[PDB]
Each structure stands twice: as C-alpha cells, then as structure tokens.
Design a protein around this ligand. Structure first.
Ligand SMILES: Cc1nc(NC(=O)NC2CCCCC2)c(C)c([C@H](OC(C)(C)C)C(=O)O)c1-c1ccc2c(c1C)CCCO2
Ligand SMILES: Cc1nc(NC(=O)NC2CCCCC2)c(C)c([C@H](OC(C)(C)C)C(=O)O)c1-c1ccc2c(c1C)CCCO2
Lengths: 139, 139
C-alpha cells in the first residue's frame, strides 16, 4: 500500500508483447505494446512512467527483466529502487478479449482495455483511487 | 482552469515529431515522439491519455489536426469534445536542449525533459498540481 510502488510485467498476445504497469495500492494500470521484449523497451517505459507518477519502487514477477544495463540506467536517473497478487494481466486480458473485435490493431484494443479498467467503479475507480492516494500523500 | 481540459500540439525536432499534451490547469505534460505526424498517431495518443486521466475537452493550436476520421473515432469512444497560452513547447524544447547530450535517442531526451518539468517546483510541481486538482474535483 505504499504509494510509490508499482508492478511491471510483460504478457504475450497475438505474437506481440504487452508491457503492463500496475500501481499496487490502487490497481491502476498503464500498458504499451512493444515490438520486442527487450531491456531498452523497459527502460524507456520506466522513464515515461516516472515522469508521470512518483515511482519509488518497482516489483516484477520476472527479476531477469531488470538486469539490463539500460534498465539500470533508467532506474538510476529517475531514482527508482527495485523491490524484492494482481493478477490483472488476466483481467486485462479478459477485457482485451471483449473489445478485440472492435479494433484492427492489438494496441488499440489494449488501450481500450486500459481505459475500461481504470474507469470502472467497484466505490471509486482505480483512476480515482490513484489520484486520491497520491494527492493525500502529498500533504 | 477546468480540470478536464488538455492541450495538444506537435513540435518538430531533428526531423522528428513530438506530440505534446498539456493539462492546462496545472502545466503537467505528456509527450511522445512519433514517426509521422498523422491522424492515426494522434488518435492512439488520445486513447492512451484518456485512460490515464479524465479528459473532457481538448484544444489545439492546429485545428486541422483533429479532422481525421481516426481522431474522431477516438474522441467519440472516450467521450471527448473539442474546445474552440503555454507556451511550453518552448520550455520543453529548452529542457530537451540541456539534456540532449545525455542520450542517443531524441525520445529519451524528451522523456527526460518531461520528467524534469513535471517534477520541478516553482510551491508544488506540475506533477503535484495535477493530482491535487483532479483529486479535489473528485470529492
Ligand atoms: C477508426 C479507425 N480507423 C482505422 N483505420 C482505418 O483505416 N480507418 C479508416 C478511416 C477512414 C474511413 C475508412 C476507415 C484504424 C486503424 C483505427 C484503429 O487504429 C488506430 C491506430 C487509428 C487507433 C484500429 O486499430 O482499429 C481506427 C480506430 C480509431 C480509434 C478508435 C477505434 C478505432 C477502430 C475503436 C474505438 C477506440 O477508438
Ligand atoms: C544506457 C543506455 N544505453 C543505450 N544504448 C546502449 O547501447 N547502451 C549500451 C549498454 C551496454 C553497455 C554499452 C552501452 C541507450 C540507447 C540508452 C538510451 O536509449 C534507451 C532507448 C535505452 C532509453 C539512449 O537514448 O541513450 C541508454 C540510456 C538508458 C536510460 C537512460 C539514459 C540512457 C542514455 C540516460 C538517462 C535516462 O535514462
């Protein structure tokens, strides 16, 4: 429940890679579809995320993801430390499946799924919860 | 100062296109580097943004950006309406210039610049302000 904790993983769909970030306290996510499951992709993603949110620690279900020099450079620069129960990859995958017919590209469907999950209330939505948590923590 | 208002534009650097989003009330931004300045890129960006934040209206300095069918589809689905003094593209560009030497790719420098701007206090930072504004508006 610490507010600066995020979880990062890659799932595979349609021979494509989806990078999924979860803010643990709230259940909010960001995701992107990447061409390849490399360290460079992760590092860049981390950079984007850190600029957006106050990211203090990151946990992953695959430790080897975080061994690249590039990833380390990103965590060093942005001041992120590594951390050593979702499972929203299933839920996200579920939502992607429902809307997949709607879009040509997998990435579009993924973004649609992110939108639905973050928005849905079950009574704040995750999108509401993350702002509430972060703002409160600020003062 | 309405909390759901965002501003979207493209600047050019190094023969590359940067899409920049500003949350007007706070000065917070998100940016991406895109290959080409197309409607499809914008639509996809909008989707990502809308999932992340509560986006009610979007203004741009180039109205023709928003004429593509693809963009319209994105605004329709996410419930965004069009809206008809930054100028942070200069400031962002300024920051990109300072750090450009640090990275090989322009995109990395851009993300670095986003991070610096959102973080900097001058006394909340923009990153703080956007959460404060959105959370407050929620209750
Ligand atoms: C509306 C839309 N179109 C395309 N591609 C097209 O060829 N569209 C032409 C537009 C002129 C008239 C004939 C059809 C695509 C590719 C998309 C989506 O792709 C992007 C990258 C643009 C998001 C897609 O993957 O389906 C869309 C589109 C755009 C936004 C959007 C949705 C779609 C289908 C679905 C709902 C969420 O918002
Ligand atoms: C550290 C880093 N490296 C590369 N590329 C490499 O070839 N790195 C190898 C790593 C093994 C030992 C020799 C050097 C790149 C391209 C980057 C940046 O690119 C990505 C896409 C990975 C972000 C870059 O554009 O410079 C970096 C890198 C990664 C993170 C990072 C920074 C850099 C330079 C700069 C500070 C912010 O965080």
């Amino acid at each position: 429940c610490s507010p600066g904790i995020w979880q990062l993983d890659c799932t595979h769909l349609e021979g494509k890679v989806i990078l999924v970030a979860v803010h643990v306290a709230s259940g909010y996510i960001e995701a992107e579809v990447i061409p390849a499951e490399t360290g460079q992709e992760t590092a860049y993603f981390l950079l984007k995320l850190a600029g957006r949110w106050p990211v203090k620690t990151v946990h992953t279900d695959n430790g080897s993801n975080f061994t690249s020099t590039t990833v380390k450079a990103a965590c060093w620069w942005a001041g992120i430390k590594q951390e050593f129960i979702e499972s929203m990859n299933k839920e996200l995958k579920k939502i992607i499946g429902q809307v997949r017919d709607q879009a040509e590209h997998l990435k579009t469907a993924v973004q649609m799924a992110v939108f639905i999950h973050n928005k849905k209330r079950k009574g704040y939505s995750a999108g509401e919860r993350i702002v509430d948590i972060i703002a409160t923590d600020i003062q």
